[PDB]
């Protein structure tokens, strides 16, 4: 803003600023292994 009155005068100015960031991560891994071997597939008592 600027003004003059009669001599007299005045002026003014502004900035305002705001800024924001966010970063987010989630990782999941699951492994299941179930493994069986039989080598004497039967004993019968």
């Amino acid at each position: 803003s600027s003004s003059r009155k009669r001599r007299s005068s005045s002026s003014s100015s502004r900035s305002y600023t705001s800024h924001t960031n966010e970063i987010h991560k989630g990782k999941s891994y699951q492994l299941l292994v179930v493994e069986n071997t039989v080598e004497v597939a039967q004993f019968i008592n």
């Binding site: 003059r4 009155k5 080598e39």
Partner: protein, 41 residues
Amino acid sequence: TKVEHRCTTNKLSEKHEGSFIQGAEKSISLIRGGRSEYGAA
């Protein structure tokens, strides 16, 4: 005499990025006969 002149402004910006990757793997296997080292392999 009196004079006034004025101006005002407002402004914004935004940005986004996103990613989601998801995976499943399964295996099921049976072997009968052979010898345990190679059957294992």
